[PDB]
Amino acid sequence: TPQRVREAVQEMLKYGLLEESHKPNLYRSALTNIEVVDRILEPLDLAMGVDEVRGLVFVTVRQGEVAEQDDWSHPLVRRQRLNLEQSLLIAILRQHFIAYEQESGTGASQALVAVDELIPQLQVYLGELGSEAKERNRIITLLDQLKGHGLVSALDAHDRVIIRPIITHLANPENLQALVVWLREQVEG
Amino acid sequence: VSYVRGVIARQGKTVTAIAATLERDGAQVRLGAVLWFEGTSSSASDLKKLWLLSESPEQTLEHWLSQHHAGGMRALRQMEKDGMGIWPYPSKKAFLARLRDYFEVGENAFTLLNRAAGLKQLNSIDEIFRELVL
Amino acid sequence: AQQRSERYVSARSQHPAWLLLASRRAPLVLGCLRTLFEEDALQALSEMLAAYASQATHLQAGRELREWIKRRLVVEREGRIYATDALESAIQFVDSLDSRIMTSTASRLSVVQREIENLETGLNPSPTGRIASLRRRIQDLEHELARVEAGHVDVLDEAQAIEGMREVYNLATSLRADFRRVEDSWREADRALRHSIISEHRGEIVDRLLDGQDALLNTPEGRVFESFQQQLRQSAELEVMRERLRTILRHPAVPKALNRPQQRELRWLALRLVRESQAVLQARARSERDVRGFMKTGLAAEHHRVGQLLNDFFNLALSVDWQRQSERRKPACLPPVGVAITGVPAIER
Amino acid sequence: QHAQRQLNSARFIDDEGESHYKALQALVGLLKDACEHSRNQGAKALLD
Questions:
Q1: What's the CA gap between C12 and A2, in Å, rounded?
Q2: Which of C313, C325, C342 to mutate to test the interface with A (most CBs of A within 10 A)?
Q3: Fewer CB near the terminus (10 Å): N or C of chain B?
């Protein structure tokens, strides 16, 4: 097995994804060896997802020959599940990412969002607390929880966060449709 | 500088760290600070500081010291990308703002707490109210 | 008469310039912004707002900057901030309160009369009238030449010279008024085109637009600017204009008519005009390139359907009870993506 | 109150104002219905 393929596979397994704008060599190595990487990851019940438009390569749970697996009982998955509050915040962030990606052209940039923009839109649904410090603590805690899934970054000195492109593959229309169906079932009885 | 250099018991490259822990029913918070001197240039502008606010049970004083010993400053600021319950600040102003937001207090509670923590003698009522409370 | 009050109220509520003028911190914001266009914006704004307490600074600085960005007084493209026409209108109004050049003068009247004559003779198709006008003007010039040959050279007095210099400055300085207006006109065309592409997304429209080489983003201001910048390129007259300006600026009456900044502005007029005109075509080219890139990416239908699904989810989310911690922590239905493998616990093996 | 919450939530969509208009229409309709019959407990509970 070639050294570069092994290095790229190990790095991707360690971090969970490869981005072209940060690790171009490994991204190119892993992009041109789809069959080899798939054969390597088959024994581990894992698969590789590709996105050439955004320059992204990520790792997902391989779909076996069972009607339902929940994809969270896989032995190698360490994170916890996502609850309703985090799903709501993810939906808000996905809307912001749509807005960012629509009005962009050729060139490299990043999606930055300030907390003060996020606070009122979440107040609309969750409600309102007395002091401002309470709401700031709530938002900071939620963003810290979301950082563990690799969806955002830590707060800057100017009180801003970066939205990672991987969210575009977490809230793709299929997953959104499934979530909407499930939530509609939950609400009506 | 006097506390770091033990005014002299320690000269040249040196490391100093402090921490304090607060607990409740089902939670824990830790406030810490790491200061260091690279060489013998004992000056106010040559002391390097970092402040830490943590909730994870894995963040201890020895862990911070090990990270500093292994990578200096970059290894300390790298802990924010490998964990969740850690917040480093290379600035006391933002650190104190975050601290006052965590415990929903005013901007003068800690100053008053510091004044009444070494008061020598209970003077006249007017003097006490005009010198300590206000 | 009644509709005018409604229009004024609407302009007060909506237009960015009046909102900026009526803002609480208008003077310092105006000064800082004008100094800038002559993060870093946030840092400088905080620095200026620091030593003006009188009447938590970094939080309100960012809040106000984002408020002005929302109001479209200033524009954020990728990570940079660019000025608009409303900001320049506000600056022009504010800085004209100190010194304004009079326009009720004799020189302006003569200019108006000559310009009206020129337009009226230019709109006339009949050749006989053109011949008559040419003969009359030639005869008048010949009469003036005959008078001059007798030793009757006319020279403007000091007051007339000062009036003429100030009027020439006032007329010449107005050629830069609408440079930001063209760019603002192109940006909204870009936005409208992108919205129409998304709402349609039909691939036939995108393919047809990509195939054609005809430039998009056409606006009424763009054609006027093109006509202006085409005539700006005829250097055979720009050189004469620059030489005449240099000759004019070497006159004893100049210090009494214009101060130092005005003399500098009149000194480098042609170079600055050409330099600033060349900086708008590049913006147009960049806008067109970005639009073509967005069209070639081909993710409009995904944006449309994800927006629809997000709207459905947000409508549904209003019917659950967010006040109970039990429901806020109920597990949802979302798959694991970007799985990071657990570190093998061999550690030291 | 539910209509007001919908109106508040509909202002964050970028549809060139279509969703905002649709959300405002229902609230204006509710106000019209309340004002039409100003001699009921339900209608007086809104505007009085």
A1: 69
A2: C313
A3: C
Instruction: Tell me which residues of chain C, numbers 184 to 223, contact chain D at a CB-CB cutoff of 8 Å.
Output: 195
Long-range contacts formed by A106-110: CB under 8 A, 24+ apart:
A106/C289, A106/C290, A106/C293, A107/C78, A108/A21, A109/C78, A109/C79, A110/A162
Partners of C194 on chain A (C-beta within 8 Å) are 102-103
Which tokens belong to B34? Answer: 């790491």
Give backbone dihedrals phi and psi of A68, rounded to 5 degrees, phi first: -135, 135
Does A50 lie at the interface with C, CB-CB under 8 angstroms? no
Cβ(D7)–Cβ(D27) under 8 Å? yes
Cβ distance of A173 and C305 shorter than 8 Å? yes
Structure tokens belonging to residue C273: 């005009």
Q: Are A187 and C316 in contact (CB under 8 A)?
A: yes
Closest to C217 measured CA to CA, from C236, C194, C244, C240: C194
Residue of C nearest to A96 (CA): C307
Q: Report the greatest alpha carbon distance in chain A.
A: 61
- Residue pair A27/A20 in contact (Cβ under 8 Å)? The answer is yes
Distance CA A54, CA C293 (A): 13
Q: What angle is formed at CA B35 by the lines to CA B33 and CA B38, rounded to 5 degrees?
A: 160
Q: How far is CA C172 from CA C169, C242, C245, C280, C349, in A?
A: 5, 12, 11, 20, 82
B128 sits in which H/E element: helix B125-128
What residues of chain D lie within 8 A of the CB of C318, using their CB?
2, 5-6, 9
Instruction: Give, in order, the Cα–Cα distances in Å from C151 to each of C140, C155, C161.
Output: 17, 12, 21
The technique is cryo-EM
- Dihedral sign for Cα atoms in the order B114, B116, B119, B125: positive
Residue A56 tokens read as 């992204």
- Picking from A104, A108, A111, the residue whose alpha carbon sits closest to that of residue C194 is A104
Tokens representing residue C204 in the block? 């036939």
CB-based contact D9 C314, cutoff 8 Å = yes
Dist. CA C150–CA C203, nearest whole Å: 79
- In degrees, rounded to 5, the angle at the alpha carbon of residue C302 between the alpha carbons of residues C298 and C303 is 95
